[PDB]
A paper describes a structure:
Whilst BT3333-S1_156S-sulf was only active on GalNAc6S and is the first member to be functionally and structurally characterised within the S1_15 subfamily. BT3333-S1_156S-sulf also contains an SpII signal peptide but whole-cell assays, using GalNAc6S, indicate that BT3333-S1_156S-sulf is periplasmic. The 0 subsite is made up primarily of polar interactions. These interactions probably drive the specificity for GalNAc versus GlcNAc substrates. In BT3333-S1_156S-sulf, however, occlusion of potential positive subsites is achieved by an insertion between β-strand 3 and α-helix 4. Comparing overlays of BT3333-S1_156S-sulf with BT4656-S1_116S-sulf, the GlcNAc6S sulfatase encoded by PULHep, reveals that the two substrates bind perpendicular to one another and thus no interactions are spatially conserved. The active site of BT3333-S1_156S-sulf reveals the specificity determinants for Gal over Glc-configured substrates when compared with the GlcNAc6S sulfatase BT4656-S1-116S-sulf.
Here we report how a core PUL has evolved to metabolise the complexity and heterogeneity of CS-A, CS-C, DS and HA. Crystal structures of the two PUL-encoded carbohydrate sulfatases provide key insights into substrate recognition by these critical, and therapeutically relevant, enzymes. PULCS/DS/HA encodes two O sulfatases belonging to the sulfatase subfamilies S1_27 and S1_15, the endo 4S sulfatase BT3349-S1_274S-sulf and the exo-acting 6S sulfatase BT3333-S1_156S-sulf, as classified by the sulfatlas database. The data presented here reveal how the HGM has evolved a core GAG utilisation machinery (PULCS/DS/HA) to target diverse GAGs in the human gut.
Numbering used by the authors: 32 to 206, 207G, 208 to 511
Protein backbone atom coordinates (compact mmCIF):
# COMPACT_ATOMS: atom_id res chain seq x y z
CA UNK A 1 0.00 0.00 0.00
CA UNK A 2 1.00 3.72 -0.26
CA UNK A 3 -0.45 5.24 3.00
CA UNK A 4 0.07 3.25 6.27
CA UNK A 5 -2.72 2.87 8.88
CA UNK A 6 -1.71 4.76 12.11
CA UNK A 7 -2.53 3.46 15.62
CA UNK A 8 -1.37 5.58 18.60
CA UNK A 9 -1.88 3.88 22.01
CA UNK A 10 -1.47 5.77 25.31
CA UNK A 11 -1.11 3.43 28.27
CA UNK A 12 -1.94 5.27 31.54
CA UNK A 13 0.97 5.78 34.05
CA UNK A 14 3.06 2.93 32.52
CA UNK A 15 6.64 3.30 33.87
CA UNK A 16 9.96 3.13 31.94
CA UNK A 17 10.68 0.08 34.22
CA UNK A 18 7.23 -1.67 34.09
CA UNK A 19 7.99 -3.69 30.87
CA UNK A 20 10.26 -6.78 30.55
CA UNK A 21 11.73 -5.36 27.23
CA UNK A 22 12.90 -2.38 29.38
CA UNK A 23 14.50 -4.82 31.91
CA UNK A 24 11.60 -5.55 34.36
CA UNK A 25 12.38 -8.97 35.99
CA UNK A 26 9.40 -9.20 38.41
CA UNK A 27 6.74 -9.00 35.65
CA UNK A 28 6.69 -10.37 32.09
CA UNK A 29 5.11 -8.44 29.13
CA UNK A 30 5.54 -10.85 26.16
CA UNK A 31 3.07 -9.16 23.71
CA UNK A 32 4.62 -5.68 24.21
CA UNK A 33 8.14 -7.28 24.21
CA UNK A 34 7.26 -8.97 20.83
CA UNK A 35 6.12 -5.49 19.55
CA UNK A 36 9.50 -4.06 20.76
CA UNK A 37 11.37 -6.91 18.92
CA UNK A 38 9.45 -6.18 15.63
CA UNK A 39 10.09 -2.40 15.69
CA UNK A 40 12.04 0.48 17.29
CA UNK A 41 12.35 0.56 21.15
CA UNK A 42 13.19 4.14 22.41
CA UNK A 43 15.35 4.56 25.61
CA UNK A 44 15.32 8.43 25.70
CA UNK A 45 11.68 9.22 24.73
CA UNK A 46 9.67 11.73 26.81
CA UNK A 47 6.06 12.93 27.22
CA UNK A 48 5.58 16.74 27.56
CA UNK A 49 4.24 16.32 31.15
CA UNK A 50 4.29 14.17 34.33
CA UNK A 51 0.38 14.03 34.26
CA UNK A 52 -2.45 12.98 31.88
CA UNK A 53 -4.43 15.95 30.48
CA UNK A 54 -1.33 18.03 29.55
CA UNK A 55 0.64 15.15 27.85
CA UNK A 56 -2.49 14.20 25.76
CA UNK A 57 -3.02 17.93 24.89
CA UNK A 58 0.62 18.30 23.76
CA UNK A 59 0.39 15.11 21.66
CA UNK A 60 -2.88 16.10 19.82
CA UNK A 61 -2.18 19.89 19.44
CA UNK A 62 1.60 19.89 18.82
CA UNK A 63 1.54 22.81 21.34
CA UNK A 64 3.18 22.55 24.80
CA UNK A 65 0.23 22.27 27.23
CA UNK A 66 1.90 24.74 29.66
CA UNK A 67 1.22 27.54 27.07
CA UNK A 68 -2.56 27.37 28.01
CA UNK A 69 -3.97 27.84 31.57
CA UNK A 70 -6.72 25.16 31.57
CA UNK A 71 -4.57 22.07 30.57
CA UNK A 72 -3.96 20.57 34.09
CA UNK A 73 -5.53 17.24 35.29
CA UNK A 74 -9.14 17.74 34.17
CA UNK A 75 -12.32 16.84 36.09
CA UNK A 76 -14.91 14.39 34.61
CA UNK A 77 -17.16 17.41 33.78
CA UNK A 78 -14.47 19.74 32.25
CA UNK A 79 -15.54 21.66 29.11
CA UNK A 80 -13.45 20.65 26.03
CA UNK A 81 -9.93 22.14 26.67
CA UNK A 82 -8.84 22.23 22.96
CA UNK A 83 -10.39 25.20 21.11
CA UNK A 84 -12.42 23.84 18.09
CA UNK A 85 -10.46 26.27 15.72
CA UNK A 86 -7.18 24.51 16.76
CA UNK A 87 -5.76 22.15 14.05
CA UNK A 88 -5.25 18.75 15.84
CA UNK A 89 -3.27 15.67 14.70
CA UNK A 90 -6.73 14.09 13.99
CA UNK A 91 -7.68 17.07 11.72
CA UNK A 92 -4.43 16.90 9.72
CA UNK A 93 -4.80 13.07 9.34
CA UNK A 94 -8.49 13.67 8.26
CA UNK A 95 -7.18 16.22 5.66
CA UNK A 96 -4.58 13.52 4.61
CA UNK A 97 -7.56 11.18 3.77
CA UNK A 98 -7.78 8.96 6.94
CA UNK A 99 -10.89 7.70 8.76
CA UNK A 100 -10.28 8.91 12.39
CA UNK A 101 -11.43 7.43 15.72
CA UNK A 102 -10.76 7.82 19.47
CA UNK A 103 -11.37 4.81 21.74
CA UNK A 104 -10.91 4.80 25.55
CA UNK A 105 -9.51 7.42 27.98
CA UNK A 106 -10.13 11.01 26.77
CA UNK A 107 -9.40 13.39 29.72
CA UNK A 108 -9.42 16.50 27.43
CA UNK A 109 -12.94 17.70 28.42
CA UNK A 110 -16.35 17.59 26.69
CA UNK A 111 -19.04 20.23 26.15
CA UNK A 112 -18.99 24.04 26.39
CA UNK A 113 -18.14 26.80 28.93
CA UNK A 114 -19.88 25.85 32.24
CA UNK A 115 -18.84 22.16 32.16
CA UNK A 116 -20.22 18.94 30.58
CA UNK A 117 -24.04 18.45 30.42
CA UNK A 118 -24.17 14.61 30.11
CA UNK A 119 -27.96 14.49 29.35
CA UNK A 120 -28.22 15.21 25.61
CA UNK A 121 -25.90 15.70 22.62
CA UNK A 122 -22.50 16.63 24.21
CA UNK A 123 -20.81 19.23 21.95
CA UNK A 124 -18.14 20.23 21.29
CA UNK A 125 -16.71 16.65 21.68
CA UNK A 126 -13.86 14.63 20.04
CA UNK A 127 -15.83 14.89 16.74
CA UNK A 128 -15.45 18.77 16.88
CA UNK A 129 -11.61 18.43 16.65
CA UNK A 130 -11.12 15.87 13.83
CA UNK A 131 -12.32 12.41 15.10
CA UNK A 132 -15.08 10.81 12.93
CA UNK A 133 -15.89 8.27 15.71
CA UNK A 134 -15.79 8.65 19.55
CA UNK A 135 -16.11 6.01 22.29
CA UNK A 136 -14.57 7.48 25.45
CA UNK A 137 -14.13 7.46 29.21
CA UNK A 138 -14.73 11.17 30.03
CA UNK A 139 -11.66 11.59 32.31
CA UNK A 140 -10.15 8.81 34.51
CA UNK A 141 -11.90 5.65 35.87
CA UNK A 142 -11.49 7.13 39.45
CA UNK A 143 -13.47 10.25 38.33
CA UNK A 144 -17.27 10.73 37.92
CA UNK A 145 -19.20 10.28 35.87
CA UNK A 146 -18.44 6.51 35.52
CA UNK A 147 -20.16 6.22 32.06
CA UNK A 148 -19.01 5.97 28.39
CA UNK A 149 -19.73 8.62 25.69
CA UNK A 150 -20.18 7.38 22.08
CA UNK A 151 -20.45 10.04 19.31
CA UNK A 152 -21.59 12.73 21.81
CA UNK A 153 -24.20 10.58 23.72
CA UNK A 154 -23.90 8.69 27.08
CA UNK A 155 -24.28 4.90 26.33
CA UNK A 156 -27.42 3.49 28.10
CA UNK A 157 -28.53 6.88 29.51
CA UNK A 158 -32.24 6.98 30.55
CA UNK A 159 -33.69 10.53 30.01
CA UNK A 160 -36.04 9.92 33.03
CA UNK A 161 -32.83 9.38 35.21
CA UNK A 162 -30.68 12.37 34.13
CA UNK A 163 -27.04 12.71 35.33
CA UNK A 164 -25.76 15.63 37.42
CA UNK A 165 -22.01 15.87 38.27
CA UNK A 166 -20.37 18.33 40.72
CA UNK A 167 -16.72 18.53 41.92
CA UNK A 168 -17.42 21.46 44.36
CA UNK A 169 -20.20 19.97 46.60
CA UNK A 170 -22.45 16.86 46.89
CA UNK A 171 -25.40 16.62 44.46
CA UNK A 172 -28.07 13.94 45.09
CA UNK A 173 -28.11 11.34 47.90
CA UNK A 174 -25.80 8.53 46.57
CA UNK A 175 -23.45 6.99 49.18
CA UNK A 176 -19.87 8.40 49.53
CA UNK A 177 -16.57 7.04 50.91
CA UNK A 178 -16.74 9.89 53.51
CA UNK A 179 -20.28 9.16 54.83
CA UNK A 180 -20.72 5.42 53.95
CA UNK A 181 -17.47 3.52 54.69
CA UNK A 182 -19.66 0.38 55.20
CA UNK A 183 -20.29 0.40 51.36
CA UNK A 184 -16.54 0.83 50.40
CA UNK A 185 -14.99 -2.40 48.99
CA UNK A 186 -11.67 -0.69 47.91
CA UNK A 187 -10.57 1.71 50.73
CA UNK A 188 -9.08 5.11 49.76
CA UNK A 189 -5.42 5.85 50.77
CA UNK A 190 -5.62 9.51 49.54
CA UNK A 191 -8.90 11.49 49.03
CA UNK A 192 -11.18 9.41 46.68
CA UNK A 193 -13.99 9.64 49.29
CA UNK A 194 -16.91 11.05 47.20
CA UNK A 195 -19.58 9.07 45.26
CA UNK A 196 -19.25 5.22 45.50
CA UNK A 197 -19.74 3.28 42.20
CA UNK A 198 -19.51 -0.56 42.33
CA UNK A 199 -18.16 -0.24 45.94
CA UNK A 200 -15.22 2.07 44.90
CA UNK A 201 -15.38 5.69 46.13
CA UNK A 202 -14.52 8.09 43.26
CA UNK A 203 -13.34 11.73 42.87
CA UNK A 204 -16.36 14.12 42.51
CA UNK A 205 -20.12 13.67 43.18
CA UNK A 206 -22.76 12.32 40.74
CA UNK A 207 -26.42 11.25 40.70
CA UNK A 208 -28.53 9.67 37.91
CA UNK A 209 -27.51 7.55 34.86
CA UNK A 210 -27.74 4.31 36.94
CA UNK A 211 -28.28 2.21 33.72
CA UNK A 212 -25.23 3.93 32.04
CA UNK A 213 -22.75 3.10 34.88
CA UNK A 214 -19.83 0.86 33.74
CA UNK A 215 -18.54 -2.34 35.41
CA UNK A 216 -14.86 -1.61 36.26
CA UNK A 217 -13.68 -5.24 35.69
CA UNK A 218 -15.01 -5.09 32.04
CA UNK A 219 -13.37 -1.74 30.96
CA UNK A 220 -10.23 -3.28 29.25
CA UNK A 221 -12.53 -5.78 27.39
CA UNK A 222 -14.95 -2.95 26.33
CA UNK A 223 -12.08 -0.64 25.11
CA UNK A 224 -10.35 -3.58 23.34
CA UNK A 225 -13.63 -4.62 21.52
CA UNK A 226 -14.47 -1.01 20.40
CA UNK A 227 -10.88 -0.61 19.09
CA UNK A 228 -11.21 -3.97 17.16
CA UNK A 229 -14.67 -2.87 15.77
CA UNK A 230 -13.13 0.39 14.50
CA UNK A 231 -10.19 -1.52 12.88
CA UNK A 232 -12.50 -4.22 11.29
CA UNK A 233 -14.90 -1.41 10.08
CA UNK A 234 -11.99 0.39 8.26
CA UNK A 235 -10.21 -2.84 6.98
CA UNK A 236 -10.30 -1.42 3.36
CA UNK A 237 -9.37 2.27 4.03
CA UNK A 238 -6.51 4.22 5.60
CA UNK A 239 -7.48 4.79 9.29
CA UNK A 240 -6.09 6.56 12.39
CA UNK A 241 -7.00 5.05 15.80
CA UNK A 242 -6.09 7.13 18.89
CA UNK A 243 -6.49 4.61 21.75
CA UNK A 244 -6.26 5.28 25.54
CA UNK A 245 -6.22 2.33 27.99
CA UNK A 246 -7.42 2.68 31.61
CA UNK A 247 -4.51 0.33 32.63
CA UNK A 248 -2.46 0.86 34.74
CA UNK A 249 -4.36 3.86 36.32
CA UNK A 250 -6.26 3.60 39.66
CA UNK A 251 -8.53 2.02 40.54
CA UNK A 252 -6.78 -1.17 39.27
CA UNK A 253 -9.68 -3.64 38.68
CA UNK A 254 -8.27 -6.54 36.57
CA UNK A 255 -10.78 -8.83 34.82
CA UNK A 256 -11.10 -12.04 36.93
CA UNK A 257 -8.95 -13.92 34.34
CA UNK A 258 -5.92 -11.63 35.25
CA UNK A 259 -6.75 -11.06 38.99
CA UNK A 260 -3.99 -12.55 41.24
CA UNK A 261 -1.90 -13.74 38.20
CA UNK A 262 1.11 -11.30 38.64
CA UNK A 263 1.83 -11.67 42.40
CA UNK A 264 2.37 -7.85 42.48
CA UNK A 265 -1.29 -7.30 43.54
CA UNK A 266 -3.77 -5.49 41.22
CA UNK A 267 -1.02 -3.08 39.95
CA UNK A 268 0.89 -6.08 38.46
CA UNK A 269 -2.41 -7.71 37.35
CA UNK A 270 -3.37 -4.70 35.11
CA UNK A 271 0.17 -4.69 33.55
CA UNK A 272 -0.68 -8.28 32.33
CA UNK A 273 -4.21 -7.09 31.30
CA UNK A 274 -2.55 -4.18 29.41
CA UNK A 275 -0.06 -6.61 27.73
CA UNK A 276 -3.08 -8.81 26.75
CA UNK A 277 -4.89 -5.67 25.31
CA UNK A 278 -1.85 -4.86 23.05
CA UNK A 279 -1.77 -8.63 22.10
CA UNK A 280 -5.44 -8.39 21.00
CA UNK A 281 -4.65 -5.31 18.79
CA UNK A 282 -1.62 -7.16 17.21
CA UNK A 283 -3.73 -10.38 16.60
CA UNK A 284 -6.56 -8.30 14.97
CA UNK A 285 -4.04 -6.59 12.61
CA UNK A 286 -2.46 -10.03 11.77
CA UNK A 287 -5.98 -11.52 11.13
CA UNK A 288 -6.79 -8.73 8.59
CA UNK A 289 -3.24 -8.80 7.06
CA UNK A 290 -2.82 -5.10 8.20
CA UNK A 291 0.37 -5.77 10.32
CA UNK A 292 2.91 -4.85 7.61
CA UNK A 293 1.53 -1.44 6.46
CA UNK A 294 0.24 -0.16 9.88
CA UNK A 295 2.35 2.24 12.05
CA UNK A 296 1.61 1.00 15.62
CA UNK A 297 3.01 3.43 18.30
CA UNK A 298 2.72 2.25 21.94
CA UNK A 299 3.67 4.61 24.80
CA UNK A 300 2.41 6.21 28.03
CA UNK A 301 0.96 9.65 28.99
CA UNK A 302 3.32 10.06 32.01
CA UNK A 303 5.52 8.06 34.44
CA UNK A 304 4.42 5.51 37.05
CA UNK A 305 2.93 5.72 40.57
CA UNK A 306 2.77 2.87 43.16
CA UNK A 307 0.09 4.17 45.64
CA UNK A 308 -2.09 6.66 43.66
CA UNK A 309 -5.06 6.78 46.09
CA UNK A 310 -6.46 3.32 47.01
CA UNK A 311 -5.30 0.76 49.60
CA UNK A 312 -4.55 -1.85 46.85
CA UNK A 313 -1.26 -3.08 48.51
CA UNK A 314 0.77 -1.94 45.42
CA UNK A 315 3.78 -1.08 47.74
CA UNK A 316 3.35 -4.22 49.97
CA UNK A 317 3.08 -6.49 46.86
CA UNK A 318 5.88 -4.69 44.95
CA UNK A 319 8.29 -7.66 45.50
CA UNK A 320 11.43 -5.75 44.36
CA UNK A 321 9.73 -4.53 41.09
CA UNK A 322 11.08 -1.09 39.98
CA UNK A 323 8.42 0.77 37.89
CA UNK A 324 10.74 3.86 37.70
CA UNK A 325 13.70 1.64 36.61
CA UNK A 326 16.86 3.44 37.92
CA UNK A 327 15.22 6.92 37.58
CA UNK A 328 14.33 9.39 40.35
CA UNK A 329 10.72 10.59 40.92
CA UNK A 330 7.66 9.20 39.09
CA UNK A 331 4.20 10.54 38.07
CA UNK A 332 3.79 14.31 39.00
CA UNK A 333 7.64 14.83 39.14
CA UNK A 334 10.17 16.98 37.18
CA UNK A 335 12.70 14.14 37.92
CA UNK A 336 13.30 11.84 34.90
CA UNK A 337 10.72 9.10 35.76
CA UNK A 338 7.96 11.80 35.52
CA UNK A 339 8.23 12.20 31.69
CA UNK A 340 10.56 9.32 30.63
CA UNK A 341 8.10 6.79 29.08
CA UNK A 342 8.27 3.48 27.20
CA UNK A 343 7.92 4.24 23.44
CA UNK A 344 7.78 1.56 20.67
CA UNK A 345 7.20 2.17 16.89
CA UNK A 346 6.39 -0.87 14.69
CA UNK A 347 5.99 -0.47 10.88
CA UNK A 348 7.31 -3.77 9.35
CA UNK A 349 7.01 -2.79 5.64
CA UNK A 350 9.37 0.20 6.18
CA UNK A 351 11.16 -0.01 9.59
CA UNK A 352 13.85 -2.56 10.69
CA UNK A 353 14.03 -3.72 14.34
CA UNK A 354 16.24 -1.28 16.34
CA UNK A 355 16.95 0.51 19.66
CA UNK A 356 16.60 4.33 19.34
CA UNK A 357 18.80 6.08 21.96
CA UNK A 358 18.23 9.56 20.35
CA UNK A 359 16.48 12.24 22.48
CA UNK A 360 12.78 12.18 21.34
CA UNK A 361 9.66 14.08 22.59
CA UNK A 362 5.94 13.18 21.99
CA UNK A 363 5.52 16.93 20.98
CA UNK A 364 7.17 16.05 17.58
CA UNK A 365 4.73 13.19 16.58
CA UNK A 366 2.28 15.68 14.82
CA UNK A 367 4.94 17.39 12.57
CA UNK A 368 6.72 13.98 12.06
CA UNK A 369 3.52 12.25 10.71
CA UNK A 370 2.59 15.40 8.66
CA UNK A 371 6.11 15.26 7.04
CA UNK A 372 5.74 11.44 6.36
CA UNK A 373 2.40 12.11 4.52
CA UNK A 374 3.71 15.36 2.89
CA UNK A 375 0.60 17.05 4.46
CA UNK A 376 0.94 20.88 4.71
CA UNK A 377 0.22 22.54 8.13
CA UNK A 378 -1.51 25.94 8.55
CA UNK A 379 1.13 28.54 9.70
CA UNK A 380 -0.23 28.46 13.33
CA UNK A 381 -0.66 24.59 13.49
CA UNK A 382 1.42 22.25 15.77
CA UNK A 383 3.59 25.26 16.78
CA UNK A 384 6.15 23.41 19.04
CA UNK A 385 6.21 20.16 16.97
CA UNK A 386 9.51 19.63 14.98
CA UNK A 387 9.79 17.12 12.06
CA UNK A 388 11.96 14.17 13.36
CA UNK A 389 10.51 11.39 11.10
CA UNK A 390 13.98 9.80 10.56
CA UNK A 391 14.43 9.57 14.38
CA UNK A 392 10.79 8.25 14.82
CA UNK A 393 11.49 5.46 12.23
CA UNK A 394 15.00 4.61 13.61
CA UNK A 395 16.49 5.79 10.22
CA UNK A 396 18.74 8.33 12.07
CA UNK A 397 20.22 8.54 15.62
CA UNK A 398 19.93 12.39 15.64
CA UNK A 399 18.70 13.67 19.05
CA UNK A 400 16.30 16.64 19.37
CA UNK A 401 18.49 19.71 20.25
CA UNK A 402 16.66 19.76 23.64
CA UNK A 403 13.38 18.49 25.20
CA UNK A 404 11.12 20.24 27.74
CA UNK A 405 9.48 18.50 30.74
CA UNK A 406 6.55 19.87 32.83
CA UNK A 407 5.69 18.63 36.38
CA UNK A 408 2.40 18.82 38.36
CA UNK A 409 3.12 22.46 39.52
CA UNK A 410 4.15 23.54 35.94
CA UNK A 411 7.87 23.59 36.93
CA UNK A 412 9.73 23.12 33.60
CA UNK A 413 12.99 21.21 33.02
CA UNK A 414 15.10 21.09 29.84
CA UNK A 415 17.43 18.26 28.65
CA UNK A 416 20.21 19.33 26.21
CA UNK A 417 22.92 16.81 25.26
CA UNK A 418 24.15 15.39 28.60
CA UNK A 419 22.62 18.17 30.78
CA UNK A 420 19.30 18.41 32.66
CA UNK A 421 18.32 21.81 34.18
CA UNK A 422 15.26 22.13 36.51
CA UNK A 423 14.22 25.79 36.93
CA UNK A 424 13.54 27.01 40.48
CA UNK A 425 10.00 26.80 41.93
CA UNK A 426 8.23 27.94 45.11
CA UNK A 427 5.93 24.84 44.99
CA UNK A 428 6.29 22.03 47.62
CA UNK A 429 9.32 19.68 47.24
CA UNK A 430 7.07 16.69 48.26
CA UNK A 431 3.58 15.99 46.74
CA UNK A 432 1.01 16.17 49.60
CA UNK A 433 -0.88 12.87 48.84
CA UNK A 434 1.69 10.38 47.38
CA UNK A 435 4.80 12.05 49.01
CA UNK A 436 6.37 11.80 45.47
CA UNK A 437 9.58 13.92 45.01
CA UNK A 438 8.26 16.69 42.61
CA UNK A 439 11.76 18.24 41.94
CA UNK A 440 10.45 21.70 43.06
CA UNK A 441 13.43 23.60 44.68
CA UNK A 442 13.91 27.37 45.42
CA UNK A 443 17.40 26.87 43.82
CA UNK A 444 18.37 25.68 40.34
CA UNK A 445 19.23 21.98 39.77
CA UNK A 446 21.71 20.67 37.15
CA UNK A 447 22.26 16.90 36.55
CA UNK A 448 24.78 15.24 34.20
CA UNK A 449 22.49 12.39 32.94
CA UNK A 450 25.50 10.77 31.07
CA UNK A 451 27.19 10.17 34.50
CA UNK A 452 24.25 10.54 36.95
CA UNK A 453 21.05 9.27 35.17
CA UNK A 454 19.38 8.77 38.65
CA UNK A 455 19.82 12.57 39.36
CA UNK A 456 21.71 11.88 42.67
CA UNK A 457 24.22 14.77 42.35
CA UNK A 458 22.98 18.39 41.81
CA UNK A 459 26.08 20.09 40.21
CA UNK A 460 24.42 23.54 39.65
CA UNK A 461 27.00 25.22 42.05
CA UNK A 462 29.78 23.55 39.94
CA UNK A 463 28.51 24.89 36.50
CA UNK A 464 26.92 28.39 36.75
CA UNK A 465 27.56 29.15 33.01
CA UNK A 466 25.75 25.87 32.09
CA UNK A 467 22.87 26.84 34.49
CA UNK A 468 22.82 30.34 32.84
CA UNK A 469 22.77 29.10 29.18
CA UNK A 470 20.10 26.37 29.79
CA UNK A 471 18.06 28.90 31.87
CA UNK A 472 18.20 31.44 28.99
CA UNK A 473 17.34 28.61 26.53
CA UNK A 474 14.29 27.44 28.56
CA UNK A 475 13.02 31.08 28.96
CA UNK A 476 13.31 31.60 25.13
CA UNK A 477 11.12 28.48 24.49
CA UNK A 478 8.59 29.96 26.98
CA UNK A 479 8.47 33.41 25.23
CA UNK A 480 8.81 32.04 21.63
C1 LIG B 1 -5.54 12.14 45.86
C2 LIG B 1 -6.01 12.17 44.44
O1 LIG B 1 -7.14 12.52 44.20
N1 LIG B 1 -5.18 11.74 43.51
C3 LIG B 1 -5.50 11.67 42.08
C4 LIG B 1 -4.91 10.44 41.39
O2 LIG B 1 -5.55 9.28 41.92
C5 LIG B 1 -5.17 10.51 39.88
O3 LIG B 1 -6.60 10.30 39.62
C6 LIG B 1 -4.60 11.82 39.36
C7 LIG B 1 -4.69 11.99 37.85
O4 LIG B 1 -3.96 11.01 37.16
S1 LIG B 1 -3.71 11.33 35.66
O5 LIG B 1 -2.90 10.26 35.15
O6 LIG B 1 -5.13 11.27 34.94
O7 LIG B 1 -3.12 12.64 35.65
O8 LIG B 1 -5.27 12.92 39.95
C8 LIG B 1 -4.99 12.92 41.34
O9 LIG B 1 -5.66 14.06 41.79
CA1 LIG C 1 -1.54 9.10 33.52
Amino acid sequence: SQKPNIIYIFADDLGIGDLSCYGATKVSTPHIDRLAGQGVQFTNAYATSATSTPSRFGLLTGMYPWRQENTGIAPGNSELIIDTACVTMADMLKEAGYATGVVGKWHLGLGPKGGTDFNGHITPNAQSIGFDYEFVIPATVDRVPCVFVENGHVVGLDPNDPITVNYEHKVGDWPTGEENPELVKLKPSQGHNNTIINGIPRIGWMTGGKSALWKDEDIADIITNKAKSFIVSHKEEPFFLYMGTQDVHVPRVPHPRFAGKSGLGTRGDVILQLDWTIGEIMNTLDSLQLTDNTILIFTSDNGPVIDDGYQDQAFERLNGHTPMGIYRGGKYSAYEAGTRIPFIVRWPAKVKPNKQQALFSQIDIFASLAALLKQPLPEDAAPDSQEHLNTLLGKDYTSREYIVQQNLNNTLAIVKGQWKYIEPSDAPAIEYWTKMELGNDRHPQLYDLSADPSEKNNVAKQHPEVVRELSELLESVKTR
